Design a protein around this nucleic acid. Structure first.
Lengths: 109, 80, 98, 95, 95, 106, 97, 82
DNA sequence: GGACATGCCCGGACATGCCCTATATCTGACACGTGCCTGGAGACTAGGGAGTAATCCCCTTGGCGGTTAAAACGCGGGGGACAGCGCGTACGTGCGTTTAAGCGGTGCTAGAGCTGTCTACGACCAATTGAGCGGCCTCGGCACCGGATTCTCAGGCCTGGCTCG
DNA sequence: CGAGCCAGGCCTGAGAATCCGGTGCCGAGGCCGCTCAATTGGTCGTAGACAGCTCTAGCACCGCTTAAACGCACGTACGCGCTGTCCCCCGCGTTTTAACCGCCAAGGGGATTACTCCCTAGTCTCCAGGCACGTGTCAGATATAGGGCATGTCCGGGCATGTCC
């Protein structure tokens, strides 16, 4: 019997091809499912996770902070135009809001 | 009853402050109370409907998450 | 004479303070009593999970913050600073909630 | 011992260690990541199912998945995702 | 000879039941077909999700009823539930 | 002889057709017998209400045939139908003749 | 000769065009615009008649609604004349801007 | 290749659209923004429509493609198919 | 101070087009007849998912208290909400023109739509085990509290030049 | 010329960001045990890729007519700016009060496991009604004509203040 090696490893991915496949199969989406669909899904989810984690890490280091916290996730999403667009209708718990003051509210000399 | 006064004036001021407003009219408070109450009515209606369909007697966090999702604002952090 | 800041300075200071942090601003227990009273008008003797009230409270504060952001923007459009009920009504009418 | 509850915690951690070896993750943040991944999953799978139905297609393939990804993701994100998906699928098929 | 799917004869019978003096144009009939199909899709989809969330694999009348209660406004929901219950009871007795 | 479930139930929409469309939409693996009957009954109710209002509007316009304009009037004048169809655009429907009070002459 | 007061004819046109239902945007320039935009996304597209009519109905409904909201914001500001800032406010509050 | 047909979206047409919306007075400067807005709308719809057209191995945009595109952008349209 | 006559303003009497009402024609779009065949209706079988009974423990509900940060109230005030007025400038409204919008007819072929075959692709089931999830430890990153520090800012003392007798 | 009083400038008195530091703490990361589902393997239905044919209308062209766009002239109504007012909310201070954490009892139902049962997928067979096709036919678009009234405009009555005897 051949040594068992995982599909994620075969694809160079970290997300589970088998698990994503089972959830896709059992999500009542279709009776027949292709082999490449879970590969694509795992690749897109890993890519998006990698980009969000990059921005959140950047924000954390800018704050001299070593662990990603929800505040850093909220800052990372809102500070990128495309992530903010994708997640326009998403509220992050414990995320707060962007520091931003309208020009008219600032004091004048 | 009298619990509508538990959303206290400094609390509405603080929520409004996070919204970025600098000055708050005295008539704002009643308006905020009304808007919040209507919002709650709709959310709680949906939540209790879900609880009753499942033959439960306690509103769960997941019921609330579904109510919020179907209301058009998805909330992350309590499951799902 | 005792020190006194001109109107606005403390408003900006509190704006910065509450926009920098994320801890919840509405009191938990009065909201909980309100939610159970309102809920009882729909189904009697209903129960609530703790995490359910916390979810409802997070949602409420996010909704109010967004509504107040839009109200402030509409007020500024009218070369005003102080928000008034008609501003709330305009914001909600244009959002499509009325 | 409770019932089997599926989650992606270990895979998110593996990707994080790939992209940021010295960075951790909190439980709240992991919950936010799980909500995000599940949401994207639901969106893509639903759009792909609808696409397949519209064209009288009874089998789920990779073309509808790719088109759904292109519809939901912005420009450069779609191009990068498509490149990764094609390379990964062709490499898998080689095995 | 390409068979299609429409409710034309049934809409016409209901119209004759309520007003046996009025006609209907092609554009109005198209709007009625779009409307009925849209309502159908909304109610069936909500019922399907409801059933999935509670670990139910069969579409029965209780989930349909709850979905109707969620989607229809007050008086509309009450009248629809009353008519549905009377009709289902008459059918079940008639077998 | 063959007699249909709609006939036994006294309804106008076809139980069989609604059943086929629910079954073939890939919605669920089993389907109850009462669900399509209930659905047909609700659809009938809503059709009867919309045609009632549209007929009324047509008669108010001295028209014997309902047109899309009358459908738009019916949907937008009824508070609950307007709520149900808040995000719905009806072709050739136009808008309600609504003029703001402040815009009227003095 | 005779000259109508400013405002009466505007209102007359409002009533006229709100009473009837014919399309108000010209078919041919809209079709030409559609073809120009389509050219930059995919080459040599062909369009159904009912497809261009669909785009035109959707566009006219969208613009009518946007102008309604713009008018409401202008009157809210004690104005009658619509301004670019009014359009921008309406679109920002609607959430598309 | 059609060029500079943007001038075909005329000023009086936009005026009539505003009349149907209940607008009594229209600034002369409104039109270019409106034209831009109109263009933006088209850019979204056509991208989805052509995508559907391209997915189905078709090269001619159909009414059903457009209705589905409009529906999936939340602006569902009645009268051209369900 | 009383009488007089008119200037002026506002509420009733007026010639053009817009709204409303009446009616002939048709015509093509709406209502009705037909064949059939594919989906709907009657019937038998199975099995697995749904209905129902017993447990529990954990997850919620209920209660006392303290005390302190938050809530309720008093009050000065000043800056923003609101009313009033000028203007001029860009927009409402009228008219000639051309410019193209809109309708009728035909091309025909690219491209949408219906059908034939079958072989790759995916549903479906047995055994397995290794990845995936529940439970426990811990220590380090995070949370809470005390500490010195500077900074953009305010105030008092000294200097200097203007003014009056 | 001498004394006076203040404007103004510069060198010491100040509530929040600069960290700076320390200590506790609790929960995520790792490890281990259990466990259940993805694999691998194989077989068989099946459906959609590709060919092939048909046939629909999209595109282009031509022609014509006529409503609309555009440019210009002109009057004008209010957006913006400015000024004045006022009122009522921000900020601070004082008193209150319940929020929240702490702790402990108790019960009830969500979920689990097991047993049963009945309801619909599946298949078969037969039949009926819904949809192209066709055809009759009639209500609104188009067109013309007639009544009546809104409107920017005019006129008469009442009010008011100026003037003479």
């Amino acid at each position: 019997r051949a040594k068992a090696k995982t599909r994620s490893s075969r694809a160079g991915l970290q997300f589970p091809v088998g698990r994503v496949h089972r959830l896709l199969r059992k999500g009542n989406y279709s009776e027949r499912v292709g082999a490449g669909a879970p590969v694509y899904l795992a690749a897109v989810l890993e890519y998006l996770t990698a980009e969000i984690l990059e921005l959140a890490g950047n924000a954390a280091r800018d704050n001299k902070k070593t662990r990603i916290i929800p505040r850093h996730l909220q800052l990372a999403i809102r500070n990128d135009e495309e992530l903010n667009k994708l997640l326009g209708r998403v509220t992050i718990a414990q995320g707060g809001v962007l520091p931003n003051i309208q020009a008219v509210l600032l004091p004048k000399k | 009853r009298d619990n509508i006064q538990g959303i206290t004036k400094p609390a509405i001021r603080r929520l409004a402050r996070r919204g970025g407003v600098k000055r708050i009219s005295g008539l704002i408070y009643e308006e905020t109370r009304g808007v919040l109450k209507v919002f709650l009515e709709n959310v709680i209606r949906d939540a209790v409907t879900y609880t009753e369909h499942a033959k439960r007697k306690t509103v769960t966090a997941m019921d609330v998450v579904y109510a919020l999702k179907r209301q058009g604002r998805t909330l992350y952090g309590f499951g799902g | 004479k005792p020190h006194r800041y001109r109107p606005g300075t403390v408003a900006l200071r509190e704006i910065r303070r509450y926009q920098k942090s994320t801890e919840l601003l509405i009191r938990k227990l009065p909201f909980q009593r309100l939610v159970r009273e309102i809920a009882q008008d729909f189904k009697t003797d209903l129960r609530f999970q703790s995490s359910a009230v916390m979810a409802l409270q997070e949602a409420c504060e996010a909704y109010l913050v967004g509504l107040f952001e839009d109200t402030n923007l509409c007020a500024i459009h009218a070369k005003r600073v102080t928000i008034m009920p008609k501003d709330i009504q305009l914001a909600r009418r244009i959002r499509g909630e009325r | 011992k409770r019932s089997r509850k599926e989650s992606y915690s270990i895979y998110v951690y593996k990707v994080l260690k790939q992209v940021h070896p010295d960075t951790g993750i909190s439980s709240k943040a992991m919950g936010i990541m799980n909500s995000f991944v599940n949401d994207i999953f639901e969106r893509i799978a639903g759009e792909a199912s609808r696409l397949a139905h519209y064209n009288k297609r009874s089998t789920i393939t990779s073309r509808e998945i790719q088109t759904a990804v292109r519809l939901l993701l912005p420009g450069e994100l779609a191009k990068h995702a498509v490149s990764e998906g094609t390379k990964a699928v062709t490499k898998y098929t080689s095995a």
